[PDB]
Subunit: 334 residues, 4 copies
């Protein structure tokens, strides 16, 4: 397996770690955060959203011990001091949320890693990948700093791919009704985004999203054809994309759902899923797919305007994609 290091052992870092435990291709050997092993161990064992960790965790000296394997714990605020190379770490998952610009993410490379996966939309990255959509575009020689995009983009892109390929998207707009995250605030505090400054668990909070425009990074044909926003709400995990699009081909609900179902069971199995059950957000807590079509919500007007709704566990699905992307990158040679 490829040795992985996780920088920022938080909601995404720990979920990636948990996903990695059940992946034979990658091995997490070290984590970095801003605290001590005791604290990281406690957070890893008991999760308010995902429950008790299905593993034995303990602390040995300054390190974590998980299922008998020692995981080195670092506490370096500056990634340049990480010394990844010294411990054979080849891939670093950059999940602090502070180092989304290449010049920052690349510090892991200076520290000895060979690749960095930024767990968020990035700036100046070598390439942005959405698994199931454009991983074939990854180039092992040219791309060292790779963004895995956002959880919303990972939800929308796979079914946008399907709609576009099968019926052609003329233009479309989305809204994601999205669980709150740690980028928000408990009770009205300063934030660059005056909406995200407001009490997260008390309101429906509109916030801008680059997700629909970011679909263009992975589906160039859709450049300038999409836009949308988010509405953060008082749930702690699980989100849902609501896309309204104008199509080129005339369609029925049955045809749209049938195409989506086909892709889910075929080419996009494990990435896109399809449900005809009348479910609610809690039901998708722990879902590892990127996107699950809520088939009951599909509607069409004039055979040209379609609404497609798709669920995603914003922490889990995206983290499993990070793990898939790391395994994929390792498979192309390091």
């Amino acid at each position: 397996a490829v040795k992985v290091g996780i920088n920022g052992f938080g909601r995404i870092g720990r979920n990636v770690f948990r996903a990695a435990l059940k992946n034979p291709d990658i091995e997490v050997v070290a984590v970095n955060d801003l605290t001590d092993a005791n604290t990281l161990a406690h957070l890893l064992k008991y999760d308010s959203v995902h429950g008790r960790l299905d593993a034995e965790v303990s602390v040995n000296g300054n390190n974590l011990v998980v299922n008998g394997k020692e995981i080195i714990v670092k506490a370096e605020r500056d990634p340049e001091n990480l010394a990844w190379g010294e411990i054979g770490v080849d891939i670093v998952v950059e999940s602090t949320g502070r180092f989304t610009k290449r010049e920052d993410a690349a510090k892991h490379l200076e520290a000895g890693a060979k690749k960095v996966i930024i767990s968020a939309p990035a700036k100046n990255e070598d390439i942005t990948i959405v698994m199931g959509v454009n991983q074939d575009k990854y180039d092992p020689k040219a791309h060292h700093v790779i963004s895995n995009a956002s959880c919303t983009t990972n939800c929308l892109a796979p079914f946008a791919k399907v709609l576009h390929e099968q019926f052609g998207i003329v233009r479309g707009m989305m809204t994601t009704v999205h669980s709150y995250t740690n980028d928000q605030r408990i009770l009205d505090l300063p934030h660059k985004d005056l909406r995200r400054a407001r009490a997260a668990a008390e309101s429906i909070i509109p916030t801008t999203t680059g997700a629909a425009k970011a679909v263009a990074l992975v589906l160039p044909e859709l450049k300038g054809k999409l836009n949308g926003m988010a509405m953060r709400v008082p749930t702690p995990n699980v989100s849902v994309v609501d896309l309204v699009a104008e199509l080129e081909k005339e369609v029925t609900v049955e045809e749209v759902n049938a195409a989506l179902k086909a892709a889910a069971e075929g080419e996009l199995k494990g990435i896109l899923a399809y449900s005809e059950e009348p479910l609610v957000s809690r039901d998708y807590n722990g879902s590892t797919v990127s996107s699950t079509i809520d088939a009951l919500s599909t509607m069409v007007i004039d055979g040209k305007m379609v609404k497609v709704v798709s669920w995603y566990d914003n922490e889990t699905g995206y983290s499993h994609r990070v793990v898939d992307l790391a395994a994929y990158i390792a498979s192309k040679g390091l």
Copy 2:
């Protein structure tokens, strides 16, 4: 002026009562529910959403006393037994949520009332009205069982009117991210709507919105041109409509927002409002308008697809409209 009776002194019944206290053209003289005066008085005084009633409330026998005015309290499950005529009640607000079918609502008329306003989409009603949109259609001789539509329809219809008149709507789809209501469930209990059966405060819950297609009742030109859904979320009040529409005329964001702002300050003042502030749902708690455009959220693609977002206090705005409709009906003669 006009004597009003409120059947179902709940979220809408009590909010209507509060709105009526401000209206000199109406007088609420009686309320009916399924409990005693002491309980209704306690509920009216202390509200979890709206705070403490700014008025003196007490109980005298089987009646409420509000600012020295006695309000008769009835506890008749069957509206046939209401004897509204005996106490001079001319207009009954039917807000129990159980009597939206004319067969049931009309019992108030048999019991002596002259008019009934159903506080929800109805079946077999004489007419459905949205203030600011089609009150002109009301006929005092022909219409005695009148629906005030839904809170979502009251939010959407006023700005849909504007968009259609100014640019023409080809087709459009909406989603309302909506606060939970008493039609939902605390913890997974049977419900005819399997989504609404689920714990209200724990999930994002896709479900129905009365606004889907009902806008056509008040804007016939939009028949078959709109559809949509709701997403019930863990907030106790305030909701927001998100409409994505294809327009006939080419527009810019500036033009859409300018038309909306013009209507808000003009023809639709008091019904439609316009905000350029980056607010959140809690900020609209207590808002009496039907619809407030969140101008910052307006977006356009190809000058033809537009997204317009509008806030509404689902309890307050709608209840103030019920009061406006009652005063309007009274003004055309009883």
Copy 3:
């Protein structure tokens, strides 16, 4: 082994059903509620608190099919019409919340069952049992309508037993900070308890606890020595008892905790548990014990006043006790 019927397939009914699937001495063969099989199947499959049912569920006609076993579905509002005897049901779990009075619960016996377990404090029941505390008081010949007490009493009685036996309780008072339940209201609606009338997910709500005084039913020596209250809060499951008691013997924190830990590992293992971890309510979601001491919270003043805090999953722990009680009753002969 023993055929069981569940009357009221709700939070407790379904949780009991899940617990029974693990017990080989029990077989649930029928459930009754107020809806159709399709609805009960959907509720059993997807739970907002406990997640997806770890079993295969389908519907065949008017029945549920769970792991290939058919479970009969009834929809009889009046228990007299249940005909339990016709299907060989020996033990009925009465979990509707409506039939806690013997006059009502006993109808199941008239309908052919041999025993009824009321899932709540009861009136005129033959006996009230708390497993681990007084099951030996059960008499197979004399007792046919049995109450399993409340979830709070099941939490408090086991450790009160320990404290009293080891140090002697002079008097004590409790408060349970308790998750909201279906007996509450979504948004301010009439309730005989004016506090429980108020929006459940919006407030800390003082109210009643069945555990106040009921511990005396199972620990007669404590008659008149305890009292207390509940504080319902905005969490959907998991509660915590906070007991402050004056003891007869002088003690230290260490001694109290040591006795509690001893009982947990000994005589009360599986009923009472002991934790030295700094956990929070979500961590106990799914806990099957009746009571888990939060050892870190133990404190003493003057060697005589002690505070003991204990967690309980109010749905799960209690439901597992209902199953234990059913197996116990069956073991003494039907």
Copy 4:
């Protein structure tokens, strides 16, 4: 009258500012935080808990303008750089949460202020005051760095004073069921307190409190006689103290409530209030008193063990007390 500066314009800082608008003895002339005027103005204008500020707010340069009065906005992380003296600020309310140790709070004095009120329990402070309890212990010459204690201590101390004086407290233990605060975490993140690290809006979270022991600072007679804890829950504001105490004198519920009511209507009017209404936390949102006895919850066992429950708006009541303490200090001479 006295010019005040607020360091840390957050939940307490802004609430203090609002309370000061209603006080003729002090004038807030400057505020310091870590952001720009535009952000502080937006936060002051729209509050998720307390609603819209009923005042005209605007920004002029780097300052706030409230009802035409300019409030200077600073953004100095290090209080040494505050230059309070230059603007005539005599009293600084230290509400950042970072400077509770005298050595840090005293930096405001080095910067030119004459007095500092730390809005929290402090270390090495000159004196700790609870209004209504020991303000007469304040010495204008000797005490420059003063703590206003915690919100919980402000709730408990006033009624503990009454119980002790009237009946004598032998010993007692408290739990405050308390709204979450900004010291907590949105989704499981590192925190020195492993319970406070956990998702604030998802659980009941036990946490240690120095509040009951801190009562001794203001009621020396109660040294070593009290202790207790907190349970943080998913409400955004309002908390409740639950005290269980052994008394010296034999009492009845009636007598305890009568003494509490007497103190509320007499010596402690404005500080301690008394309610016989069955209210819930939301009803106390905006309450300016320090403590409101929930008279219905009072209970006694053996005439010696009493439970007294008291409400408090943890943001508002405490902030009004800060303002009272600032006016009091100004009244003794600066």
